[model samples]
Every structure is written in C-alpha cells, then in structure tokens.
Target chain A: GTILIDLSPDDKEFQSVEEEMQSTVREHRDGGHAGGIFNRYNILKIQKVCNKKLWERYTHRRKEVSEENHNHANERMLFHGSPFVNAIIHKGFDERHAYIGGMFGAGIYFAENSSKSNQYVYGIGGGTGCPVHKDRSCYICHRQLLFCRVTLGKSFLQFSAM
Target chain B: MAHSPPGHHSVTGRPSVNGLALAEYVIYRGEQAYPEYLITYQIMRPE
Candidate 1:
C-alpha cells in the first residue's frame, strides 16, 4: 500500500483529496473489499489531470503556431465550446501520422490537420476547416469523459483576434 | 483558462466547485458498511 505523494503541506484541499487518492491507490494495489468503488473514483481524478493538461497543450500549440506563421496560421482557425463530450470524430494528422480525439480531431473539433507540421495551423474543433473526417457515421466518440464542460454547440464561445 | 472551457463536459462522477481551472478530485476507500462519499472532485489549477 503506497501513500499519497503529490499533496503539499498547506494544501487544505489536497490534504484531504490526497488521502482519498491514497486509499484508492492502496485499494487498487491491494484490494480493500471487492474494491471497484475506490479505484473507480480515483480514475476520475487521474483522467481530469490528463484532460486538463492535454487541452492546455492543445491551446498552447495555437500560440506556437500563431508565432511561427506570423498570424497567418491563426487566421484560418475558429473557436467553439461544448459539443457532446466526445462529439468530434477521428481525423487528425500529426507528423506521427493519423490521430483523433475531441481535442485532436474527430467529428466535432479539429486542432491539427494533415498539413505539414511546420506551416499548418492547429485550431479547436467544430470550425469551417474542422470536419474532413475519414468517415461521416461516427456517433459515440466521447464517452466516460472527465468532469470538464459540455461540448454543446450552444455553450460555445469564440477566441478570435482582430 | 477557466473550468472545462467550452467543448468539454465534466464526467457524471462529480461537479467542479471552483470551476475546472482550479478543480480538484478525491476518492476515499469505500467501506463495506456504507461508502456514501466515495469520490470528491474539484477544479484546481496549479499555483
């Protein structure tokens, strides 16, 4: 049974949260009672970290592209909010080749395209140049997602620079 | 920069008290007797 390691001294919030996570880690490593409940909740916490960080990476990529292209890259892009959870279909082409996700590319959003990494722009999904997918029948792409935001076309807001 | 920031949805597991930006989460070990609050989620960004 391992103890929590991320918690700081005065993080009143994490102090408790860390305790719970530690219990969960322990249960996962060494079952406490049939033990699906403990691990279940912990997965939720870990995935949020993954989602939040990935979104930040996706956002940061924009700034990177904008700088490299001298604003020309950002011009072709658009912003959106809340579309189902995994509304976007799979269709993003990184230098690593085909990739897909709500953050990457799918039915809903398209951050990076098949374009060469050097000159291409990576914007949020649900925009004009966002939907060029490998298929048009993708439905349930985003499921079991994090405690994030709804991917509704309604709750969406734009991020455009004059 | 704030909360889920559009285009994303919080899981059905828990709600973000301080929005997704500063949200946090916790999952205590469930007790056989009663595991009422098995999970705790928040929106905490790094300081």
Candidate 2:
C-alpha cells in the first residue's frame, strides 16, 4: 500500500470504458494524485455528453466563438486530431506538465491568438501544483495519451494515403 | 525524435478500441543526478 507502483494494465486490467473513467476518479485517492475533486468525473456520467456526431453538426455554431469566446463548435474540437485540436483542451499526459494555462491549466499564456494554444480547460483545482498554493490537486493532462496513440497519426499520415 | 520517431508498432489497437495499436511499459529516467527506469503507463479513451 505504501509504494503504490501501478506499472501497467498488464493482464488487461482496464477492461472497459466505465472502468477506465472510474479508475481516473480513483487515481485521485490511491495513486500519484490524492485530490481528484475536479469535475471531470461529473461529465462522463451526468453532464451533457458531447458525442462525435453532434460535433460535426455544430460547424457553424463554432464560428460564433472567438479566441476567447466558446460555443457549439468548441465540442467538435474534441475529436481526435481535428483541425483546431487545441493542445490545452486535448492535452496528452506527456506535454501538459510543462504546457500552461488554457483548458486544463492554471495560469498565463504565450500564444493566445494562434489556433495552437494550450486547452488548460480546468483551472479550478490543484494541478501540477498551481504556483499559487501548490495543492497538487488535480490531473496533469486532459487525458492520458497512450504511447500507441502518439504514433497512430504518423502511421496513417506517413504510411498510408489517408 | 529528430525527424521521425525511432520506432513503430506492428499492430493497430490490438487489445482495445481506439486506445492504441500496441501497448508497452513506459520508462523514464529518475529526476535525481543518478538515473533509473521509472516505469509509468498511459491510458486513452476513444473520446
């Protein structure tokens, strides 16, 4: 119980999607982070689920949003590797640690005008030890990016004609 | 990687859907002056 070396899904531990999300919730208590109080657990369960189809449905609605403003098209960006896939909103585990303030971050900015800005969506809780109080409260990435994922786009884009 | 990543996977999403093609243990160097393989895992959902 003290060392807590959760090395892998070795034996296929993460059996289902619900299990994966539940484990995310559990990560707050037993693992590297202790305070998963952030509301990520809320949406995958009760809040309005922005599925893939409706994302495509709201193409025009996204135009109403600006660099600061956000609306329907905001959800469309959730799709993997979409055109406006902002890094902060879609931060993978590897980069979000050093990246800052957008969808899933704490504070400040560098490239506010560019389409490629950190998503840093949730600044409400302790994350990567937000310099203010250093609570170390929440997650480091919007979601973990399995190494396999890092290469999928390359495989298709570089290997195939898609 | 300098231009392309050093390695690649053989299969595509072998064990799960939309997770990743191949899965393996991740090793990082310990942050001390001396180094060791600090193993970590990554998770992904289709969303």
Candidate 3:
C-alpha cells in the first residue's frame, strides 16, 4: 500500500535527514530573500508499493550500469520541491506533468541543495472537499519537498552554463 | 541544455556564475527516480 510513515525524532535516519535539509538553506546568498532556513515540520518516509516488473527492470538496469562503470553505483538522493506531494507519492514521477524547455531541456528536474529545491515549493488553497487534481479542492498549507532516490546512470555532465 | 549524449541515461548541470544558478540533476525516464521521502516544512519568515 502507498503510505507515509512519520519518522521518529529519536531515529538516526531522522537526525541525518534533518541536517541534510537545514544545512543547505541558501538564503544568505540570495540577499534579502523572501524565505529563510526551513523549520522542518515532519519527515515522512514514502512507502510506495512497486510494480513487480518495473522494480525488477530498475534493479537490473542499475546493476548493468554499475558493472559498466568502476563498480560505483551512481545513485543519489536528490531533492524535488513540489506542491502535489500527494499525487507524486501515489502516481509516481511523470515527465508528462513536468515543465519543459528548462535550462537543461525537457526532463524532471531535481536539485542537490535544499534551497534550490525550495525555490519551487508552493502551496495551494482549496478546501479538503476539493480533489488534488482539481484546483481549489485540496487545501495545501505547508510547502513540501520530495527527497527522491535517483539513479543517474552514465550522466552527461554539463560543466558550464548552457 | 537538452537530452544527454547518446547512450547516457541522465543529465547533470553544474553551477555557474552567468549560466546555471544551481546544481541540477535530471532524468527523462519516470522509472529512473522514486520519491523516497516527503519533507513537510515551513519557510522561516524573513526577518
């Protein structure tokens, strides 16, 4: 079942993740930015039930990529700030809904720094009766971000600005 | 600023002064990434 499990404060994983988010707040660099460092409210583990064939394919591809490289898995935990956390958790990442023709071209965007991801975080105002898909249904209050597990297998590194 | 080189699975954008404002990672395939954690937070109001 797809669910969100609240992480316990006593958990070591919680401590690590807490720091992972707080340390990267780049408000100081932005100079008079509207937002500052985050006051994290909750860290929930996204437990999505995987499709059998999809999971298998992902693992197998990961293995292939690792073997091709110097035995180093290029997997990384990246940040994606989004308003539709509920939909992303339930439906998974879909490039179809993602913004296109960004600086890096058309793809699902992620960031290494929490502040970078924060740039995209926003909330919608709708009553609970409103469904997430429909505007003005889901009354989103808190801004949210998804800490995604991404496999950047054989990534094309863009060292300079486009 | 588009797709990766041939056979590559993803793209990485490095930070630059005149170009990229932040380091970005992107993957075209939906299966290449999974939302593992949901961090609900509030932005500290500007002082």
Per-residue lDDT tens digits for candidate 3, residues A17-66, read 77777766554244423233343333434222344454555577667767
Say which candidate scores most in lDDT.
Answer: 3
Q: How well is each residue in A31-104 modelled by candidate 2, as lDDT tens digits? A: 32423334233211111122233333223223432222322212111111111123312322222222232221
Restricting to chain A, the TM-score for each candidate equals: 0.21, 0.22, 0.68
Worst 10 residues of 1 chain A by lDDT: A112-121
Q: For candidate 3, what is the DockQ-based docking class? A: medium
Model 1: residues with Cα > 4 Å off, grouped in runs: A1-50, A75-162, B1-47
Residues B1-47, candidate 1: write the lDDT tens digits: 11323332211122233122111111111000011111223211113
Query: What C-alpha lDDT does candidate 3 achieve relative to the native structure?
Result: 0.63
Which runs in model 3 stand beyond 4 Å of their true positions? A28-60, A67-71, A123-141, A160-162, B1-3, B18-22
Poorest stretch of ten by lDDT in candidate 1 chain B: B27-36
Predicted candidate 1 versus true structure: per-residue lDDT over A55-144, tens digit per residue? 444445544434544442222221112222232212111222212232222222221111111011112222222134321111212112
RMSD list, candidates in order: 19.4, 18.0, 5.7
Candidate 3 residue A102 Cα shift, in angstroms, is: 1.3
TM-score for each predicted model, relative to the true structure: 0.18, 0.22, 0.73
**C-alpha lDDT (0 to 100) for residue A19 of candidate 2:** 42
The DockQ value obtained for model 3 is: 0.49
RMSD of 3: 5.7
